[PDB]
Write an enzyme that holds these catalytic residues in place. Structure first.
Site, PDB file in Angstrom:
ATOM      1  N   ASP A  54      54.675 -32.454  14.444  1.00 33.49           N
ATOM      2  CA  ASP A  54      55.546 -32.121  16.594  1.00 33.49           C
ATOM      3  C   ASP A  54      55.210 -31.595  17.343  1.00 33.49           C
ATOM      4  O   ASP A  54      55.260 -30.687  17.628  1.00 33.49           O
ATOM      5  CB  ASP A  54      57.067 -31.327  15.489  1.00 33.49           C
ATOM      6  CG  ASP A  54      58.449 -32.149  16.124  1.00 33.49           C
ATOM      7  OD1 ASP A  54      58.621 -32.441  17.623  1.00 33.49           O
ATOM      8  OD2 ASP A  54      59.839 -31.959  15.814  1.00 33.49           O
TER       9      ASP A  54
ATOM     10  N   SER B 243      67.139 -32.236  14.816  1.00 31.50           N
ATOM     11  CA  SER B 243      66.421 -32.031  16.620  1.00 31.50           C
ATOM     12  C   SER B 243      67.833 -31.969  17.138  1.00 31.50           C
ATOM     13  O   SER B 243      68.201 -30.125  16.154  1.00 31.50           O
ATOM     14  CB  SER B 243      66.507 -33.666  17.124  1.00 31.50           C
ATOM     15  OG  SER B 243      65.267 -33.131  18.455  1.00 31.50           O
TER      16      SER B 243
ATOM     17  N   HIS C 190      57.360 -35.601  15.801  1.00 32.46           N
ATOM     18  CA  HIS C 190      59.144 -36.002  15.137  1.00 32.46           C
ATOM     19  C   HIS C 190      59.969 -36.535  15.081  1.00 32.46           C
ATOM     20  O   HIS C 190      60.715 -35.974  14.229  1.00 32.46           O
ATOM     21  CB  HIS C 190      59.517 -35.082  17.219  1.00 32.46           C
ATOM     22  CG  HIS C 190      60.950 -35.349  18.018  1.00 32.46           C
ATOM     23  ND1 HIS C 190      61.121 -33.719  17.189  1.00 32.46           N
ATOM     24  CD2 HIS C 190      61.949 -35.343  17.615  1.00 32.46           C
ATOM     25  CE1 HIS C 190      62.456 -33.812  17.592  1.00 32.46           C
ATOM     26  NE2 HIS C 190      63.041 -34.690  17.988  1.00 32.46           N
TER      27      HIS C 190
END
Lengths: 372, 373, 373, 372
Positions: free
Chosen positions: C315, C152, C348
């Site tokens: 995600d 991320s 995610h």
């Protein structure tokens, strides 16, 4: 009560249900006194050939009183000691030659052209009348009516108040009237009257000046008179003369009853205007609270007033079965509605002449409270 | 089509599902002609920020037509030469300043006090809306609906009809909707929106009068807007500018995509009332056809309508998997039920903007015979 | 593993990409042993709300281990018997009250004035973080990284390394990330979060001192949390209670799912600084490896590392389609680049919680030879 | 300058780098005056066999001055008219029988047991010394040092200040020292000294009381003395006698030079304690600023002080090539670092005896400004 003073309301411009816009004037009169909070107003609507003169006298030497004088006045069913009572001249009032009438109609001058409207006058419905009255009510700073009421066409106007100004109407009383003009009356009295007037060559396309098409107009008046009472009223008031021989000898020789009725029906049209009679008959023929809605039910769903219908069983113009149907539909929507049916050899005219038959019910209905 | 006339329906007292009793009013409008048997009625229910204006125009100079105009009219999928179509304004309608809207909500005057209800307004659900609509339908003399339908919140109302008035509904079509508002949407878009409005000090406890809390409301509106389409829609419609330097210089300098989206979201809250928005967000977050019952299965046992669910596979607000679950439960009860899934870069808004993707199915479904009694 | 020691790196003056020059510090920590050639170094970059603590423990009585502990250690996919692994604290680290964190941000004292920077802190990007890390790597006497990687925001930093220090990076692994922060995420989670904090009157223009604007911050945190997983995760983990009546009675009565989620999101903002959160959200919203260049294609032309992108199909924050686009561009340039897509109800957060889904791939990739020079 | 007064700092508990926790005491002395803002502090660290007595005299009749008296005092390179100068006794100071020394070491009584620590005393490094000094600096309300400096082991302590308290050190001057003790010196002087002491049977496991293992200790002292100067210093100071016949006739018969050096090296250990010499030699052998880091570079990356290294080319204990390497690494990190190399037949001891060779450079370095 006090001598009544005739008044005049002006509207610089009024837009008819069909979109036409013209200035209008409207006679009215009032009895009793408007209270501090303006919560004691009763609006009376007049019938076909009548005027705003529902009660009282214009001078102390008047031969007659107003057409509902028995119901309206001090200590009567519509008690002018408690209520402020208004009554107005309808649009296209048929008595254009009555010195007390103030109306707009086919004899009014069109300010754009300097001439009588004649058949250029717009078609009007009793919704149009209701909307115009409502302009007078608002101009007087009145927000709610304690009741709106009337007989026959007056009852049609009252039903339109109830449907189109729901917030403003606590109570609605419809005497000798119906939610939709019956087909029988629509053709046999309204249509036939229009066509009798048009068939008279003196009608001259509606441009007859002061020379009224009297034959057609008398024929129109007679059709209405001959359904205004019970069958048996005519039988005994204008009885057959079984001795008279002249009617048996020429087609044009009239019976005694024909002469009596001729004299009455000619008398009642002396002050009347033929184009105005036509427009008013057209409004009666068009009378339909469901017009502009998908059913009578949907139209009635708008009503928030307590409703009292007072038909007469012997009424040939306005059969009382449709009062019951209406009232049934209102009650299934959970609304307060009742039929109080009277009986009289006077038939339809019981609603105007036989006040004693329902004054007590009117009184009681006017005192019964309404759900907020 | 003929110019459309707004009508008004009133109840002197209505009792809400939570037991509160107040007077209510409800605008509505109709298209087409009721047949003699009253067997051709379709009720359309409107979505979150819309109104009764599902089709046509109020004057011939209206710039736009109603929000489902492409589906409804002469010769269209919901054919007004054949059906009598009704649509009503929802309680707490957000477009409360729009003069064509007739609603009861926090802006309405409480008759007992002469003041606005404000946060004293009762909580409503989409079942409350269905109960009001039903009074109107009954009072119009209609016993049965040929169909009830709507997109999104409109579909929530339609589902409440199918569950709670099973002798009255022949067919239910639920577009971009679900039987229970998903948890993700209930928090990310309803709770967060409500809280964004409360956080704004301009909200003044709900008593802001004529000065709307615009910062809170715009934030509430932007959260809904940013889930209304597929992700790729935003990527191509408000693309990143990789050259501008000013956003890199101050925390408060907006990117060009932020500017475009701010502009759109500000414009759409211009006629809107904040308290109204909260109550409607609350309705959405409370939406649960199983509420009342012992389970979703039980709620659905009552449905006797032929059921058609039309989700969009890219809908982020209303994930389509729960349409499949519901339809499966109905089929195992022996009922007629189907999913017709559409696809579009428009995501949730496909249900309003991509009529072409499902109009042919709607038409077929309106013509299929009722399976149950 | 051996107990981990926190270290500290200082720059007396660092010039940010926007031209501001201030002193900065940066915590870091290392695992394993640097080899004689210094050819076995892997730099790990941390995500939004985390810290340098990628693995192991600071005392033997630590309840938890570092955030990627399952991937990093003896015999693991990133094998510390073989690699020297480094991880650093990002600028404006949000966990500024955590005493193991060493950062420069809005809570830091401006030496020119003796007061906190507050909103006078400069805007930073993840390229600023990569430039600082590089000074540390160089100062440690390391010329080349065997790999740079992170999930991320951590992957954003890794991508900035691959673009801007191409003679130094052999391999880049970008987990649950994208070359440009998607527009949907930039508005729905970064802009909206920043604005939620500003809207809170407790924010006091950034000068709230020790009294954090908790309402604004919780709202900011809840928006991120509600996109961190697949939608179905929230539906089954905080399921709707279809029996409770109290939410139906007042606007302000919370559902049980709202209560559970409020509790979690309040807990996770306990050590967190609001201004810090804003600056980091700003970094995320500004993330764009094409910034600087004439296009994404040009930015990627500079990459010479073997590249591995590991997105999660579910995600919602980082849609995987842009990993495929990027990899395609690199392949058409003749570079070695691949996508290895995982699937998980965790969305995610699969990138941090479902190590098992990709550890075998990471291991293989760390052992594949460099394709370019 | 004024007669110096010896002082004593106590630490109720100090935790060593190896985790051991014990009370500690530490002698110190100061020269000059601490300014209002406490920004004029220079910390001097003493070398292997020395004490806190860097400058001045304890009584007016002292035969000698402190070991860096030429650099420290009014108007000298380390001007006590401007600076406040502190110097402390190292942990395990070898001169435990010197009446002015205050230290904790293997001759200290363990308060838990009533006995000398002996070999139960903890291993210490020059980081341990730096940390203890830092407790004294903080206890005096001092936040930054203007400089930290010293020769040889004193330079090791100073390098540890620079690496472990970066914020606190403006300037670091390391005379005749190195970042890591060279392997040659570590084995040939530190290890061999430890083993000579342990080989002496009088060592008795380290429990020798007051009867010192003098033979082993003299051997340890001699190994250090014989590398403290240039090769040629010994050749001319203790010259070969080519006439003497007795050394050629028994193995145990000593040459004249052996006797001279025997007398010097026995004299310098009269006040010295053998276990303390061992611990101090162990700290020297362990000296490594990179210990606890992954490279010398990473350790040096912590340094924020301006750095001056002053090696001596003829220094056999601390070869100057490693000063250049360190300084090169510092400069590649963009830091201010320089080598100023001196030359002298005194070799290593030039750093203590040949002050004239670098006093001017010290002065200039102490006045050169530091980047914030």
């Amino acid at each position: 009560m006090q001598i009544v003073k005739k008044e005049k309301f002006i509207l610089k411009e009024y837009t008819f249900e069909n979109g036409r816009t013209i200035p209008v004037q409207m006679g009215y009169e009032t009895y009793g006194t408007l209270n501090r909070e303006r919560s004691n107003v009763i609006l009376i609507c007049h019938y076909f050939s009548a005027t705003s003169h529902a009660a009282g006298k214009y001078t102390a030497h008047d031969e007659e009183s107003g057409w509902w004088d028995g119901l309206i006045g001090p200590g009567k069913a519509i008690d002018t000691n408690q209520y402020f009572v208004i009554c107005t001249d309808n649009l296209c009032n048929v008595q254009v030659k009555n010195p007390h009438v103030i109306t707009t109609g086919p004899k009014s001058i069109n300010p754009k052209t300097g001439d009588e409207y004649a058949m250029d006058f717009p078609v009007f419905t009793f919704l149009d009348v209701a909307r115009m009255q409502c302009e007078l009510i608002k101009d007087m700073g009145i927000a709610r009516l304690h009741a709106v009421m009337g007989p026959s066409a007056g009852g049609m106007i009252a039903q339109q108040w109830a449907v189109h100004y729901p917030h403003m109407v606590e109570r609605m009383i419809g005497v000798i009237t119906n939610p939709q003009n019956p087909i029988i009356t629509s053709v046999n009295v309204a249509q036939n009257a229009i066509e009798a007037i048009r068939l008279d060559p003196s009608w001259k396309g509606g441009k007859y000046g002061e020379e009224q098409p009297m034959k057609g107009l008398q024929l129109a008046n007679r059709m209405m008179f001959m359904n205004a009472f019970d069958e048996h009223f005519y039988e005994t008031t204008y009885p057959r003369n079984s001795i008279e021989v002249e009617p048996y000898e020429k087609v044009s020789s009239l019976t005694s009853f024909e002469k009596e009725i001729n004299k009455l029906t000619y008398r009642s049209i002396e002050l009347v205007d033929a184009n105005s009679w036509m427009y008013t008959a057209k409004a009666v023929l068009l009378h339909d609270i469901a017009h502009g809605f998908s059913s009578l039910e949907e139209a009635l769903s708008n009503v928030e007033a307590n409703v009292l219908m007072i038909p007469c069983k012997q009424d040939l113009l306005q059969p009382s079965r449709y009062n019951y149907k209406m009232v049934d539909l209102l009650q299934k929507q959970g609304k307060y509605a009742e039929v109080y049916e009277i009986e009289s050899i006077n038939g339809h005219m019981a609603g105007v002449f036989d006040i004693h038959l329902f004054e007590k019910k009117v009184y009681e209905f006017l005192n019964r409270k309404v759900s907020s």
